[PDB]
DNA sequence: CGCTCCCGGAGCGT
DNA sequence: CGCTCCCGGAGCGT
């Protein structure tokens, strides 16, 4: 097998950036910046199978990646990662008292992996002729050092340096300025745990507010670099309907509730890979503003077209 | 039985607070406010009769409260919640493709309520004969109602207004002012929820600051109410070392790592169940400064004594 | 029904 | 080893 780089040692991306991405995800070849996929392999069959079957039925490719998007959550609930994990990981208790196993471990951070997976080869192939405007899962290491704040912590006679980088689970950015940028952070549920991406996007506008980092004892690199990276969530809603007392999903539903509504209200965005909500908008206009706290995951394509003045 | 109150229709406390508290947690009697707790029984047993043996043995009670407070990931390992729970919930997963039980649902939630039940009714013991400093489960009715930030969030012709009521576990506060007080965040793991917690800490620091309040659009009461209203967090950090391929606590360590000091960092302070930790302090001082990022819990008899000024 | 609980290694990055 | 992943109802509060 053959073994590649996505940037080299100045930070920049190498020359056909994307096809070396949607290659590693492919498993045609090993990357320096990337393992291979665990358990990628069957999803993305089934994607690309979703995906030739409609584009031969007609439809322009641009269409067909906004509705397989905006349907991901159907695919990985149509993914039986259970069975395939089970042939490989303990299903038994990992302690005597406990309630997790490494089979629960793993399908846990698998279907993670796989949601983010998805939408990184997503968006690679419909970039997949564009040299300008790059996608990556994790943040590209100019944009990773940019979104690193540093915190001076004094405790007594002990001096310590605290370092905190903004989180980015994939980046669509562009190629001659990183910092311009659409930095992605999904998790297949919300709950409580949306929370955590609060705090983020939190710590993403005090990145660009010179009080506040004075406030918290916090440095940045440049302020001013990061105005044009814009910080989105994006999320699969998988609550499994059939669940036995299942107390349903925090996105499909009439209306989302209240502290659902206001982790949504700190992102810039919020996607759902789900497309028939009635409260979740389906046009996406950058300038005339946000038209709904939850948008289709499709939508992306549309603002990585108003943003990077582009077409696919 | 017989049931009681908290909180007059007022808000305030009704006299003899605390043992009120004990006695609903000892299931004496019934309380407005709280229901009963589902399956604290066993290991609130094993709570009084280590007390009881450590104070037969010659130690004084302040010492032995101390003690326990600082052991109590030991009593919650020692507490086989699971064959408990089996009677009742059944094991099968929710789902057919899923990995969550209604079992480890209910063991998941349960041994999070016990951690803070735990800490409430070791708190409510050590202030047994104390009505001027007073300990609840959640918060009480005015500094509940004194944390809860508002944001007006209007979409388009939309609008909705959003409620933002800053978490506290349990919390401990003067009865003569219920803003004078302890609120405490718990958690039986750190792990990156721990960052959770951080977001809470930094609405809680938000809430006191005018520009930020005016940055994120966010309305509060009072800011110079919270004043003496304290933001610390506590953890069992109960990762058992025997599970296979165990990778260990987060802070039962030689140094908690870079981003769990952070969490900590945005703290007033963090307590841990455990003792005998090296970086974890043993000694509080509020004049002297936070002797380090992580304090054995025992320790916050001591900052409730400094602070209310009483002996315990 | 809103909101929160998480007896934790697998997997990936450095 | 640092940090993050989580096919979600039970339980408590209202
Ligand atoms: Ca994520
Ligand atoms: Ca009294
Ligand atoms: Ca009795
Ligand atoms: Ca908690």
New binding site residues.
């Given amino acids: 097998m053959q073994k590649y780089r996505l940037y080299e040692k100045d930070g920049s991306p190498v020359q056909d950036f994307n096809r070396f991405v949607k290659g590693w995800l492919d498993i045609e070849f090993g990357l320096k910046?990337?393992?291979?996929?665990?358990?990628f392999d069957t999803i993305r069959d089934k994607y690309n199978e979703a995906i030739e079957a409609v584009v031969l039925s007609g439809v322009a490719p641009r269409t067909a990646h906004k509705a397989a998007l905006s349907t991901l959550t159907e695919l990985?609930?149509?993914?039986?990662?259970a069975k395939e994990?089970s042939a490989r990981?303990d299903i038994q208790?990992?302690?005597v008292?406990?309630?997790?196993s490494?089979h629960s471990?793993?399908f846990?951070?698998?279907?993670?992996?796989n949601?983010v997976n998805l939408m990184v080869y997503a968006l690679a192939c419909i970039l997949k002729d564009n040299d300008d405007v790059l996608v990556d899962?994790?943040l590209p290491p100019h944009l990773?050092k940019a979104l690193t704040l540093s915190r001076e912590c004094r405790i007594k006679d002990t001096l310590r340096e605290i370092?905190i980088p903004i989180?980015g689970?994939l980046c669509v950015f562009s190629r001659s300025n990183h910092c311009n940028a659409i930095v992605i952070?999904?998790?297949?549920?919300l709950?409580?745990?949306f929370?955590?991406g609060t705090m983020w996007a939190l710590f993403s506008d005090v990145a660009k507010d010179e009080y506040c980092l004075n406030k918290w004892g916090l440095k940045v690199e440049s302020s001013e670099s990061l105005k044009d990276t814009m910080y989105v969530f994006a999320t699969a809603d998988?609550?499994?309907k059939d669940?036995?007392?299942?107390?349903?999903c925090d996105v499909e539903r009439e209306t989302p509730?209240?502290?659902?509504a206001m982790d949504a209200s700190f992102f810039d965005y919020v996607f759902v890979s789900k497309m028939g909500i009635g409260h979740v908008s389906s046009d996406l206009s950058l300038k005339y503003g946000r038209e709904s706290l939850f948008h289709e995951l499709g939508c992306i394509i549309d603002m990585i077209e108003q943003k990077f003045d582009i077409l696919l």
């Fill in positions: 910046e990337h393992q291979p996929p665990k358990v990985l609930f149509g993914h039986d990662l994990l990981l208790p990992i302690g008292g406990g309630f997790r490494a471990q793993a846990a951070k698998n279907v993670g992996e949601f899962k994790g990773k370092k989180e689970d952070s999904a998790a297949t549920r709950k409580e745990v929370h955590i998988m609550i499994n669940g036995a007392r299942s107390q349903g509730r209240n502290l659902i």
